[PDB]
Amino acid sequence: PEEQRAKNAKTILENIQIYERMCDLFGVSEDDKLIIENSISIERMIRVVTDKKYQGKVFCRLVESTAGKCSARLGMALKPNVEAVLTDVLGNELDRAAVLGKRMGFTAMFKSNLEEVLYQRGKNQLKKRNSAETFTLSQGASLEARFRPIMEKHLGVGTVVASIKNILASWSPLEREISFLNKKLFPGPMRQLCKKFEYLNDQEKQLALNLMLDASLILKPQVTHKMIMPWSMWLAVKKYAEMNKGSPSLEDLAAYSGVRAFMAFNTACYMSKFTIGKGIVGDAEIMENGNDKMQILAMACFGLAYEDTGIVAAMISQPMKKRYQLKVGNFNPPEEGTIKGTSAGYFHKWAEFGNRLPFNSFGTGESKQISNSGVFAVQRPSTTNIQRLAELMARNTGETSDNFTQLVQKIREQVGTFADQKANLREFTGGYIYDITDVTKSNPKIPQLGGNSFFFEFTGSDVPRTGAK
Amino acid sequence: TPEEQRAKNAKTILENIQIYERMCDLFGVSEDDKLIIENSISIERMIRVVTDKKYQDKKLIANAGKVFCRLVESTAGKCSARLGMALKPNVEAVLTDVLGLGKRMGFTAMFKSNLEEVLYQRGKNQLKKRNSAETFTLSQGASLEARFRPIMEKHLGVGTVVASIKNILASKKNVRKPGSWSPLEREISFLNKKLFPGPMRQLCKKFEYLNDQEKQLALNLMLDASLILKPQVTHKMIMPWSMWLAVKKYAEMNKGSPSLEDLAAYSGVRAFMAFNTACYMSKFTIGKGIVGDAEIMENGNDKMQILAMACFGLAYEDTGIVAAMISQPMKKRYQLKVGNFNPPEEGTIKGTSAGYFHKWAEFGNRLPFNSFGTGESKQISNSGVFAVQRPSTTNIQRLAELMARNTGETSDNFTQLVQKIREQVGTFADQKANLREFTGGYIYDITDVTKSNPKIPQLGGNSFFFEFTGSDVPRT
Amino acid sequence: TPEEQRAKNAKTILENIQIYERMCDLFGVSEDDKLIIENSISIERMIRVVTDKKYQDKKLKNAIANAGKVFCRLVESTAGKCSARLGMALKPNVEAVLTDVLGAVLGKRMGFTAMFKSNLEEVLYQRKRNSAETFTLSQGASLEARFRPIMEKHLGVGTVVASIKNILASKKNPLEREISFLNKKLFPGPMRQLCKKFEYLNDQEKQLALNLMLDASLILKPQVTHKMIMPWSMWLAVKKYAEMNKGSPSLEDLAAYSGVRAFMAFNTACYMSKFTIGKGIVGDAEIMENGNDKMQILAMACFGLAYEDTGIVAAMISQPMKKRYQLKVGNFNPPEEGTIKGTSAGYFHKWAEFGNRLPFNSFGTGESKQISNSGVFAVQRPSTTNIQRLAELMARNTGETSDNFTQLVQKIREQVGTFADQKANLREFTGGYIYDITDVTKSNPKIPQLGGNSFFFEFTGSDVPRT
Amino acid sequence: TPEEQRAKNAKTILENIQIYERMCDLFGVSEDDKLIIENSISIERMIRVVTDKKYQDKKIANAGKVFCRLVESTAGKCSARLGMALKPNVEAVLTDVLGAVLGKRMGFTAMFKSNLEEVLYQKKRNSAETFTLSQGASLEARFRPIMEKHLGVGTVVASIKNILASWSPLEREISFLNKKLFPGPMRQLCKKFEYLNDQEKQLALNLMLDASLILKPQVTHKMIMPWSMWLAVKKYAEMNKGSPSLEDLAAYSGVRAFMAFNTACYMSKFTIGKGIVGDAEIMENGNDKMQILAMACFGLAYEDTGIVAAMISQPMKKRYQLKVGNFNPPEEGTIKGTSAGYFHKWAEFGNRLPFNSFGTGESKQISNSGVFAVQRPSTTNIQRLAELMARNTGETSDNFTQLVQKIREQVGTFADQKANLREFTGGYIYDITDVTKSNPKIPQLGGNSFFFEFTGSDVP
């Protein structure tokens, strides 16, 4: 754990170094290095120059500040100078064609998570392969081909299915992807069907994929969630910890999971700034709102676009607003704007990440007791956990001799059994929200939920041209 | 744009008004008698009968070149039946003068069909029904003459298309090809477009390969399934020609009130406004005799409910919906005291009720299990990030719907699809309590043209128009 | 026709009265003793034996020795005290009483008396071919073989299944008609398709078919005809009461086997009618019979209520409803020594119509073919579709003739399955109500307060010692 | 026979007391230290380890001696020591007392140990969630056929899975399993097990095992106490003029088994040492260990905690809220006396099938046949209708595929009906003073009924 945060602190400091120099290369001032927008541009720029299969002057649209006002600028640097900064900071490493698949894959994951909060899909045109309703399973879909194998665990079932669908139109790329899909998928006939993949027709592989994709909208898959912030926010931490002796050091807050990752976020919010200008997504005449933007930033850093809005409302220091109630723009440097600082104590509560199966078909960190064996001849109702028995039977009663048609029916009947149980179904049983002060998890709390939990919901309160359209 | 449509509709409405006015002159119908609903029903039907070549060629006598039309003749609030007459070419001359027709008569035939559906459970005084009695609610456009079936296809129910398929299957036991395709190929394509997605649509593809036994079971299964797995049928406000003439007169005689082009709509609030405006000057007949008992006097408010129900095709609609928008208490079929709407031997003239619709709605037209307008979304579930205990938020109905569209194989036999249809019924029936049609569909006040104040009606109770009550009029 | 029905019924009732009064005279039963239920039970049973041409032809074939005397155990009384007596008459006299009053037609007449006796026995005893748990489907199972064909519609699915099993067992040492009768009663669907295939089925398949159709009918309720079958003495108590109070409704006014007039004929018979109270009950020869307990069984036997929902019956009677083993009632046979107790008038304070069709269908003002709505307006609403009626519609309309035995068996299991899950929405006799006896014109319909155990044969802590 | 059995039990318990008292002399256990539960546990295990013929066949350098870990008290504080006796001296104790003869008594001795272990810790053959069906799992294969009835479906399935990984012992086990299983298609599949392929065999075992979590099996239960606790009953009875005799308390079922348990707690002892299960630094709690002991004696590890709570005169705590170590001799430790009247309520044992309660106050009426056309809901018992269809509509012609499908819908019907499912209908709780079941009582059942529930008030 301390051994972990020490390995984290090393890579974070090395990223602050890369970020500080690239800003110097592109003429970003010391105060402007703390504008979130500049980090989006700098990190993107690195990914573009690094993109070997895409392959000198380099251009970077950035923000320039003057008092409280801001303006966009076009920075310029030489391509050899850009590659020399990475080479000189990262010595005995960089052997990867994509600099470091982790390093840039994380910057690309933040960019993907922000895109998910800002748009249902609507940015990368409409190059969709899967149905519109399966987009909540499309975590990390904005990622480049390069970063998907290394950023696998963070990827959604929809993303992996889309990658397989694109492929269809020591190792094997197709086998590699179905393997990642197999690990993510809810245990049972869906995993059996993955093992039977490549034994299928081109017409059957499609049914296989689309079925497992649809089924996962109820039979939840396992996806890894980390706290991914822009580099300029890790700079704000490093700065605040050094400008404040008593406060927690960068090493203490150098985490991507647990309470330290939430403290890392709030301490970054002391010195971090964002831009505010005219125009929002789909309406150029509406002004950007500072509280609405802050929500989208906190959601982007945690990948909250598909999370239960009620869970989110419980940890947030501002009222939770649905997507089309927010007045927020591109996050790209505005032509003209104003500087707005970040909200210091945004996250009053914190929570652990649900990195494993939400229904917990194995009960790894749970009690294994699902029923009682009667000793006394005393009247009692049935005490058997119906959903855990359903989870166990699907996992346990798999027929290896089963045909594609046999497996297709078993998945449909797995969906039905859980859909008939709908009201009693519980995800992440045993998981609670804790206060920031509550480091030890000594005092658990219930989020107190009810009503629409969909972020991409259309409401009467929606902003003109959005959810109204 | 909606204005380009209203201008086009107002042109059709004005041609129809002229055809009507000219036909009334030829049959000696007084200026005031032109506004009697019954006269429109008789003139429209006459125009349909004369222009039907199949019936005119089979009719052949002097009487074959004659056109008899039972009309209402009123004195001073009191009316009487009269046999109007014109020669066949004089009827065809009026048509040649106003027009340079098929679709025009199809619409008139759709009002008569929707009036018949409200008036009768059977509708034709004939027990020769191809479908099971309980599937009568899927018989939109059943009374519609074979000629008008292709043009009005969209307005027809699954039961009307299935009984048309069954008709072809009975004759071809005991042939045409107009497109490109054959009448049966055309009919199964129409059913496939209406039918709820999933195995029912897949059984439509395999239909031409099915043997006469599998074919009949297929039809009945798709028909029974359609009673929960609601099909796609288009609806329009189709009112008589005399009612459009009563819209014309009122807009002319009253400045500031919307024009005929403003009210020229068969959809939205402007259709409700056109119906409500048409009722300022329209009239109908009240006589002795109702459907069932020949000695019961007709009720005015009861006849006004049927008229309203005929124009919007509300026979098979949820009574609680209709109740929330009409200006009288909603009565079930057999509580109503109304006659066949044909001109009576003797009766009294009654004016329609102005502002009969206090509330309005838009038409279904798409699959009812799908959502309506701007206000829904595409998000069906959540993807948990924080390990915090929460219930399943997945939309079971929307997921069931997505899986019906997305999970198609092509490699399923008759029997396999038959079980898949039955399971599809099972899945939705098991969901009854939380199953909802037209999610995002609201009721609006008549004055609320903007749709700024959406309202959900106070549902519950028996929804069926053809249910029996204690109040059921003696003999019915 | 409803008034014409009662006139035709009265003609039969008056003929039954004449047969009954003349038999009592032949058997030396006094005018006051003719109103005793136990004598009506004994006299009707007696006639069924004398008219049993199979037994009677065999009885003289076994015989000079042809002593054709008819013996009958009867109740004789001295006001409130009563005692058993053995009556006697000659077969030619018993036969002449039939011929003189009537004129083939006698079968239907005796078939009904035997039905009242099966209905009486279904109440008194809960108990050999079918499973014990399926006994609630064995109505008319005490009817002798000769009466089962006439009284077909009154027979339970278990009674018909028992007859089919009995034919199949004798064939292991006609059926076609029993199958047709079973087919009619059964809930439509794969159970009816399994009836059509039954002659092609092997002996193992045949046995599984009958057992499954029976088990399934315990939820997928069959059609059984019900009429109010009252003993002959009871109809005599109506005749006598009607000609006593001239203002009160006549016999013709109360000559009904169904509706409020049947319930009114019952309450009228109750003024003058009498039964016996003795020492000994069913299962316990030491316990004294209770009057209110015996009156409950009488009303139940007259309406065939043994298997009917307890809560429904409870809501219609003038006494607190008791489960079978809370009752102190013996045989309805003449006691050796006992007392005379008159029946309880106004026993039924509420009435209802008989449910002779499939329970899952609708009754009264709900018999309409409309079971769904076709959406015209884009207005948010729940689905209005009648799930049980739609499941019944698919059962009749669909179903493959290309179905094998195992295909049809798996389908029955699946049909029982859907309805077992549908149990929240499942309503039997929908649109049917309970009415105050005073309300003839079915106005002000009431709904019984149902909840708790509805099984008459349930075991409680109130259960009488030995039972 | 009820008091004739007590006579046969008294004879057997006394033989055990004689074997025990002699073994304790062989290993140098002081008269006071004989009444320590931990000493009865080690002595019993020693006799099983010495009577293990194959293990003795398995083994100058040969130490043909017996080694036993025992508790040595002194004052009130205690210690752990290693006792030794010559193997033929130990054998002579068994010959002096006994001349089935030994296997049955050591089987029950092993059965108490399995019950103790199941209350202490939550099997590699079966899935983890199926552990509540593994009664008698700890038993060595010598004891399994003898104690058959007492074994859980999980145990029997793991015995079959072991044979597969290599009458016959397989045929034996399948018929033992057939008797236990919920009646219907599971019992039919058991009959087909010989004709199933190895893949179908594994599916059948796991499906039968998983099903049993809802479709409850038939398992025999008895009151099993260490020999020292019966030595305590034998001591206490001879002391009080009012007190019932040992023969009067010689029961393994009914009220007398509870009165025997309580009478034993007046003179029996255990130890409070440093170290609990998992946390080698936490001090053991007396009342906590007393709950484990009562639960071990009655095999209550998997029983509904709410039932157990209503019967015991101390607050019911879930497994990880307990400060209890293994019942092995502790290095340091302090002698703690057992609690004199632990059970204030009692109940009879299950032993039969928990769902089908034949007779009791449950009649054959399962449904109603409507007469009047009155609106009402369906009154038909689904549970009972499902149960009847399993007896009446069995198809011998069914293959593996068809029987598996039927198991699944049998589970599905029961899962759907969970709200209306009741186990041991007409089964009640009674006061210890209520000897002839006159005033039945019902336990207040509401919360989580699982003993192995994690809780917030846990122990790290």
Author numbering:
A (entry chain A): 9 to 63, 81 to 194, 215 to 514
B (entry chain D): 8 to 67, 77 to 116, 125 to 198, 206 to 210, 215 to 511
C (entry chain C): 8 to 70, 77 to 116, 123 to 146, 153 to 198, 218 to 511
D (entry chain B): 8 to 66, 77 to 116, 123 to 145, 152 to 195, 216 to 509
Please share excerpts from the published article on this structure.
All these results suggested it was a new genus of the Orthomyxoviridae, temporarily named C/swine/Oklahoma/1334/2011 (C/swine/OK) and then Influenza D virus (IDV). In this paper, we characterized D/NP and solved the X-ray structure of its tetramer. We demonstrated that the C-terminal D/NPTAIL presents all the characteristics of an intrinsically disordered protein and that is involved in the nuclear import through its interaction with cellular importins-α.
